[PDB]
Amino acid sequence: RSLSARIVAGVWWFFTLIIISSYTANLAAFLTVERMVSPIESAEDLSKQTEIAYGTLDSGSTKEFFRRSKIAVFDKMWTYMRSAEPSVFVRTTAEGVARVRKSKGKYAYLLESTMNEYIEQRKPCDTMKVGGNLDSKGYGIATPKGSSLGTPVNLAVLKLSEQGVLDKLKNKWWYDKGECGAKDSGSKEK
Amino acid sequence: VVTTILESPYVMMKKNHEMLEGNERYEGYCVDLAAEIAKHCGFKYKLTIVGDGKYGARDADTKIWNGMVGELVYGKADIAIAPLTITLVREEVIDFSKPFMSLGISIMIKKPQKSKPGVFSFLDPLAYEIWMAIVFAYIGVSVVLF
């Protein structure tokens, strides 16, 4: 040893101790931050980030909604979109979806709940639907003004809804008919 | 005359349509719904595809309507069975039934689709240059020790 080898082994001990402690600490960091993130915080949360872009259709009801809404979040998003570069608006719905699939998660598409969960259930199964709906709309059966068909088709739609025909039909064409299937991966194995 | 628009999966083409004729040419949700609604209301129905393929709307200049709403108001069709969003501007010119499907605007994001490929976890936290360096320090004390 001769006291020089002792201090070499001691300073070396300090060195390797610092290094492995650093490894453990930084690995703890990389693990913690990995478990510290959630996929969907909120519809507003998507607006509160300036990296992940978000868009709607160029000519549609969604855009007009965002413009017309006086709610702070939606106005902020619209103010963003009309000045955003490049443009977050798309020509077709498929254009927007295709943009989502090629973004590596760097672009979000805002669309009808139905179309959303349908694309979610259609190949190549690359699109996930997150969060609750941002509004409340509905589809209905249109009849001519003061026609002889209005009341009966109304009552009909109602009865069909109550018997469960509508739910079963929707479930069939979304889940039974087309399938990404997998039974939602057993709820993604928890 | 039931007017509707080709939109998947509401009203679709079986692709064998060249062989068939009539309401057997179209398949989808709204087709089946039209069938049941007609079965409860008691009438024979003929499915017709709208000529422009765009839902209702109105121009400020012409003042006219286009799409399925156009075919209903100007009397080109008897009923519109399709995923038609109920708005105020339509309920003025047409009579809407109660909603048969409720929906809203939701957010779509690219699915995670991640299964961890990394063949070495240990070199992630520390930089590669740092490992090379610590090898140089190892040999650097090793030469002193020798």
Partner: peptide
């Protein structure tokens, strides 16, 4: 994601060779 640590660890890395210099200083 971070998890790239470089300069600081390079410093604490750097003090060791100084310790080797001190070792040679004491050896002679």
């Amino acid at each position: 994601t971070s998890a790239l640590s470089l300069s600081n660890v390079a410093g604490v890395f750097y003090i060791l060779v100084g310790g080797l210099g001190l070792a040679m200083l004491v050896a002679l």
